Amino acid sequence: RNLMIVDGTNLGFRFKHNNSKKPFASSYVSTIQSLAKSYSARTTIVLGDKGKSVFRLEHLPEYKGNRDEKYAQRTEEEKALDEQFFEYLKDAFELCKTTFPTFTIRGVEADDMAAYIVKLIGHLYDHVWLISTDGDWDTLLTDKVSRFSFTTRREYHLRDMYEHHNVDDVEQFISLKAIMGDLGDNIRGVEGIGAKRGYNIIREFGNVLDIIDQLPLPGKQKYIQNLNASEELLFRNLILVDLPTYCVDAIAAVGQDVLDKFTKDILEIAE
Incomplete structure (x- = not known):
């Protein structure tokens, strides 16, 4: 039995990329379930990004600043399409909660959280499967930690670095x-x-x-x-x-208490 860690927001934009008009909350979850079968996921964890990263913003105030610029410049109609997608993702995240343990810690990126789970419990399973089209998640790759991208329908192992x-x-x-x-x-x-x-x-x-x-x-x-x-x-x-070295610091930037609760919740899941 493996562990599957889903990059929720990422998967969301993939659905948005396929069609920016259609509600995607059902398929989103069914996609994660079909996948869980596929990778003999014993434990499946979905993560979403909520807010900018406190850790990286502290070390670089202009972190992701361009992404704000891109919003400021979008037409009234594009900004509205953006909001559509965001409400649909929240919906997707709500439905997920009825099936898979889901998590959003404001000011904490999904990658910092993924790295913490792998660190925390990665050893309790045979293989860990990272569900993301973001190659920066490949900083987590090992011989027991692989990635899976939908945009390519490929798998990424360490040999492939x-x-x-x-x-x-x-x-x-x-x-x-x-x-x-x-x-x-x-x-x-x-x-x-x-x-x-x-x-x-x-x-x-x-x-x-x-x-x-x-x-x-x-x-x-x-x-x-x-x-x-x-x-x-x-x-x-x-x-x-440096995701694997700063992940803990990254979760604690939003509080030692939030870090403690993320931990209790993870271990209880992998139990």
Whole structure:
């Protein structure tokens, strides 16, 4: 028996992506049930995102700021379609509650919570299945923790780190994320360094922290020059993308009491 952890909001947008007019609350849940069969899920946990992340907002006030800009600029009609989807997702989350243990902790991202559950109880099962189309969840990948994306109908294991992410392991992936940056989340990275260039730097000098010890890096390239002057940026990004290391801190940002209750609830489920 395995454990299945669903990235609820993500799955929601997938349904929204398929059709932005149709109520999706039933299929949403039935989809999770068919899937639970498929992966011999003994325990299935659905998580949703409620509010911005307190942890990352503290370390970067402009965290996901662009996503607000995108809302401010939408027409009256698009903003309304947005609200439709959001009410439909809340509905989806309500119906879920009648079948699978569901969770929303305002100010806590689903990924920080997914990482906590895996940490907390991942060992009580044979395999853990992460249901998300978000590859950043791949920072949780191990030989007992795999991901499943609907947009591709694919499965992601650790062996697949390179083809899917341009790095060899979870730590290198975090390093790349910290060096490279993350456009969608509005995280600035070193100017002139992307997946391939970043990877070649990590493969030669190692993880971000190791690279910090080593600045100035030899190389007359401007992206290198840039790299040598981003010590601070790297420290910043690292805490923002290092999911497995900062997940607990991330849940406790909303309170030691909320952390304690999330814990009791998880363990009782995996019992």
